[PDB]
Amino acid sequence: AEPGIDKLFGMVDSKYRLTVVVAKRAQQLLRHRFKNTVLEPEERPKMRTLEGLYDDPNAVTWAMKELLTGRLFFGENLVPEDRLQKEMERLYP
Amino acid sequence: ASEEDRYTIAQANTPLEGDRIATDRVVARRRGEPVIVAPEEVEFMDVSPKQVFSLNTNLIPFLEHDDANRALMGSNMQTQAVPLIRAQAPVVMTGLE
Amino acid sequence: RTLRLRKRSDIESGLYGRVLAREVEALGRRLEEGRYLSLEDVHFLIKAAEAGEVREVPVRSPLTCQTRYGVCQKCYGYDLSMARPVSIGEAVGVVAAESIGEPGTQLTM
Amino acid sequence: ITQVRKEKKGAGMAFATPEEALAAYERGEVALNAPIVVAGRETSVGRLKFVFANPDEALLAVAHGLLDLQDVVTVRYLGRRLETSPGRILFARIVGEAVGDEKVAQELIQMDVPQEKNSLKDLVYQAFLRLGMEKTARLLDALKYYGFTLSTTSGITIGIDDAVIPEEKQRYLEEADRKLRQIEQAYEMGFLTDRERYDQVIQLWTETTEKVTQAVFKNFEENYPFNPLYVMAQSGARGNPQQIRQLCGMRGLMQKPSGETFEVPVRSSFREGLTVLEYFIS
Amino acid sequence: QKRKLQVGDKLANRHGNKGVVAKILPVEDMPHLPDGTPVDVILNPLGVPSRMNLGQILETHLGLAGYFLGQRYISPVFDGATEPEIKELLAEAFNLYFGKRQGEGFGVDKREKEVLARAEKLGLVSPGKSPEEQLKELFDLGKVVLYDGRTGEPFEGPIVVGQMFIMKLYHMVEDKMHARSTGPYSLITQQPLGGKAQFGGQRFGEMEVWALEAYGAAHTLQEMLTIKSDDIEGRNAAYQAII
Amino acid sequence: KAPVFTATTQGDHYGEFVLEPLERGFGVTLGNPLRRILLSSIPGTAVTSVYIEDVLHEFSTIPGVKEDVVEIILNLKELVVRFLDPKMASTTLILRAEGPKEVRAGDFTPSADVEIMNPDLHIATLEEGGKLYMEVRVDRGVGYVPAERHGIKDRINAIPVDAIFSPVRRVAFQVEDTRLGQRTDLDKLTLRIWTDGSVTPLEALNQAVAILKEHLNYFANPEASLL
Amino acid sequence: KAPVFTATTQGDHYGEFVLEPLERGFGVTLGNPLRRILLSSIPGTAVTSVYIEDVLHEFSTIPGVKEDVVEIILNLKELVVRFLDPKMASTTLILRAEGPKEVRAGDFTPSADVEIMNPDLHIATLEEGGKLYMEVRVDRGVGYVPAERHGIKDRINAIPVDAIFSPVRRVAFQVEDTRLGQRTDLDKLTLRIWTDGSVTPLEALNQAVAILKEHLNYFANPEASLL
Amino acid sequence: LSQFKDETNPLSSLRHKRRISALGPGGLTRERAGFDVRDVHRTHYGRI
Amino acid sequence: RQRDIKDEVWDALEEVIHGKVVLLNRAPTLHRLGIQAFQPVLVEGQSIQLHPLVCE
Amino acid sequence: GTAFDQRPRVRVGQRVKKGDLLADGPASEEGFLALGQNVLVAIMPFDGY
RNA sequence: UCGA
Ligand SMILES: [Zn+2]
């Protein structure tokens, strides 16, 4: 199975809540080209490659470990969507 | 068929010996009802059990050991067959080929 | 005319992943309400009933649910396939549908 | 591979000392898996002859060719003196190695008896319950690889003599013939009319079919427990009882397309072969 | 076009047992015999008891004893070879086989001794008899001693083998296999086409939709019914996006 | 002890080998790997390339010839030919059969560095006045590669055939008990080598053993690591 | 073409080595030979029968000791030693402990160049006043030799014991088809090997491969018997 | 009652030509069929 | 154009393959398990491989 | 799309009786229907494949 | 109409 699942499900009450979380965060990772994330070089989800070993481009896996640490924060009505989305596309290109 | 329902019809598997009836009790039927008969009431017989099935179904050896389902499948699959360049006829067949 | 107990699989389908409606006293181990059920729980109920301690099994059921245009978790049960309490925003209508739907081919007998 | 192999060859004789029984084992007076008696406490020849301090030792001794894959032997294996089969120890082992610890693993599994469908199922449930998703998945896959290759080593196959009709068929069935002669001589004596004759005959073939079916399974157990067909459908690999009955046994009477069941016995099994008649009715 | 049989193609026998090709094995590894002649299929014994067809079994036995002989076998339906006949065929072919190794400077293989010994436990071969006679019986039963072409070691018990008739079915993976990324659409409704040569995608049935909902994948379903299928700018803006 | 090794050949065709005594259970470990690589990595020919001045494709029936083209191809991969030189990669062969005379591997045009192991191999039964010109490139390589996975491109029609190299017909090893050693139940391994003549049983075993020991001592300096 | 060899090991216990990639079929070719030769060869501890004071039968219980005789025998089998000098192929270790003592593999009274690589093992427990003396016979060699084979009796009442030889426990290699670039035909073969501490896994391996190229180089001289 | 010949093999066209269908224009149709329709009558025997 | 599947492609599609997974369905669709999802692994052939256990 | 072929089984010349087969068919082996082949068959659970 |  996908590594670190049981704990993931163990976090959110709704089995589906996790999905919303993963989706939004991962998409945000694709937005900024991975400079947002709380993962350091050792935690970077490197994918095995014959050519050369690089970071896995897939946003989903990234989101997985991202929440796996717990450095993130998830909640409904967290902050107004305005300042929430305006300062996200600012900090990073 | 209508006339078949009339007489007493034995089987091809009857106790054939010396062109005569061997054992007293013999396979037979009327209208499709299995009944044991005697050397007297014998009226008709079968040419060969082959007639009790179709073409492809008759190309299956030891078919009496296979359930009807998979037999059916075997036959229609014989229809599904394709040509073969090196094709080799069954080294065990029913001799009908 | 001898009243017997529903065999294992029956109650296993009946009480598994249930939610206690009211408190239960049997065999010294008290079962508070709202507590879900597992094979351990269900088999325990089995044995308890075998002792003639209990017969009736009060539980919250979809029928007894007053949730409108849907249902609740306390009225439903586990997620079955996940063995854990059913998640909110669940497909339960379709769940049910398929659940009894797949067997549709196998009752000829 | 988890099956416990036992032989009836040794007859389970009475020995005061282990050594006597051992010499008897060499001379062929006893079987390796035979439940014989030593001193005041009975035991298999293997439980004595083969003694292992730990699984790996037994693994070496067996796989080296000095012992068969399933026999009654003695081992410690997580700090207890137990008498079981190599495939059993292997079982608990692979479970543990799949999950990552063999303690709880061995804890929730049956360490006595061979593992078939339902037992496996129970274990899977206990797994996804006490353990968690990924663990259970890796477990299952271990069962896949190991199991597949195990059946591969087995080479268990199917052949004409691999299901043999019990000797009880001839006897009980011809008995049913005599009984039919009774019912028929009744029908003309006035004691039995037509319909009730039909009923007596119908129950006659009922109980006949059951006598011979019972005979089939009993024969497969009492004699050839390692019978491939038997074992197969038995452990829930592939099959059902009625199948085994019709394949080796009496296939049983058929049903008219109108829905009123036939009065004529089909007798002979699939391997015996069916006459044209039986085949058509069926 | 010459089409060699590919991996995954439909094949079946006269006795009504189907299947598809799974991973053709190299000539190297294969369960050969003391003559070093490996087998060509190695079909699993499962579908036999469930689907109840013994004809393939008997056919395979007659082919076992018959391969050595090469003579043909006419077994008309309900009238033909029986257990005693084929039994004699087995005893015959074996006599001449043990003969084949006897004069060629061989004898009983230790691995075969092992298999015979293990089989002697369940009474598969009548005990008290020498391994020669025992292999006569075993071979007669339809099964002989096979050696794994991978390890070289024998198998725990005998394996029924022989000559049996099969067939290469019409359905061929080289044809049935199809896929499409973005193709044309129906005129009436922008829903994609279907069929193979029409270059079109699969349809998602009502029950498919239901199952998808049962999982509770909301977006997967939405994208399915919209972006992924006929949506106005949806498919277009999609291609744009991934591109 | 001393591993007494006796090596039996017969011709370039059929030969066996016996080594006794040996350690209990070893005979498996010897016998199978040998056979494995013995049936695979051994180079051979079974031709590849074929051309005829009369044909469209692998099908169209040549007048004066009983079998069609692809049947003559059924007779191709079944043809074994060895070169008298180790260093000749590719080659070519020329064939002419006119009149009502049959065609066989021996009917070819002999040359340097070529020998046919089966001149009695039937090709086509040529009827009255059948005229046919033929040419084939018989190359050498390893294993078995179907015609569809390798190209040719000679002339107007250049049609590949399967390449079954593997000159070994078959390998059968048997582990028996030998009286030839100190203890009890030893392994006398008899490896039976069936070859077609492109390579004698002896040298077949030789090259097999070569790749064996080589890929064996392939274990070099590794890289360790620990959790 | 470039059979990269990697070995990741831990302690004198475990090691896992992969040759990635390898030719199709070769990955299964080296698995079983290395398997059986690893387990049927490579000598080691090999502990035989031990005399015991006051202990006659292998059954009769021993006063002043928790575990019975047989349990102790198991504990003896588990132990592992090594001869520092190839000169000494046989030794007799001894131990004597009385009273309430904790009896271990460490308490074992030493010997000549024989060394115990297993310092902590629980052999037995002695109750108050428990008297014990034993002299154990230890040797070398490979494979497995149960109490049936070796008839070893040193002193009068000495009791034969199953001898553990090969340092390795199990091997059972895991091979899998891998993929690099194109051509799915590659082999990923992996080995899980155990060691009792005598030799580190890498050592056992290399020794095996030595046995391998040796027995492989057994083929030189032919003897021509052709029929 | 008229469709593409079965040329999948010789035995294909053979068998196909030897097959009979109760369907079509003036037989029964898919919508109407019972048990007795597709069943095998007692006197079927050496006929079908 | 030109079936020239040479390594430029065969190994790039790889770089996009890892992570995201696809779905497989076997008609009829009865249980939701009739549609499951698996990590794509490219294999030589025109056929489809699937885990033997979920096949049921 | 199934190929139709007829292979001559008679030599350059010989005399035959009436009914003797001079040519094969899409599947015909010497006057016998040849569907598949009789090739060697084993029965066992091989690596669960 | 035929596969599954
Ligand atoms: Zn509610």
Side-chain angles (χ1 to χ4, degrees), chain G residues 2-118:
Chain G
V4 178
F5 173 59
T6 312
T8 58
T9 65
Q10 190 152 36
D12 51 19
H13 351 283
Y14 218 138
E16 294 174 33
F17 346 107
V18 181
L19 194 75
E20 194 177 9
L22 194 56
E23 140 79 1
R24 49 111 75 170
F26 283 13
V28 204
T29 305
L30 25 63
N32 43 287
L34 270 167
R35 223 229 166 188
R36 300 170 64 98
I37 294 197
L38 272 162
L39 303 194
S40 62
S41 301
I42 299 93
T45 147
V47 42
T48 23
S49 168
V50 43
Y51 171 82
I52 352 86
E53 253 189 339
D54 313 282
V55 186
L56 8 80
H57 207 183
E58 196 211 19
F59 277 74
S60 66
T61 180
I62 193 271
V65 169
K66 290 262 190 174
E67 312 94 313
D68 89 293
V69 32
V70 193
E71 189 90 38
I72 312 308
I73 301 176
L74 279 333
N75 297 295
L76 304 188
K77 306 184 200 173
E78 287 175 320
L79 191 48
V80 47
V81 300
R82 176 168 60 172
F83 295 89
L84 294 175
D85 58 334
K87 172 208 302 303
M88 187 163 294
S90 171
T91 188
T92 308
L93 296 86
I94 64 278
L95 184 270
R96 186 180 301 247
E98 89 299 331
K101 204 70 185 65
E102 169 76 297
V103 164
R104 313 157 100 270
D107 277 43
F108 232 102
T109 318
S111 278
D113 274 322
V114 206
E115 60 156 35
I116 305 185
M117 292 201 61
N118 194 314

Side-chain angles (χ1 to χ4, degrees), chain C residues 60 65-67 72 75:
Chain C
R60 287 190 53 170
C65 194
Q66 289 202 48
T67 324
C72 72
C75 287

Side-chain angles (χ1 to χ4, degrees), chain G residues 192-211:
Chain G
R192 35 165 177 175
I193 194 165
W194 282 277
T195 46
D196 63 352
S198 292
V199 293
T200 169
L202 187 56
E203 270 174 348
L205 174 61
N206 276 284
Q207 201 197 313
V209 332
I211 311 175

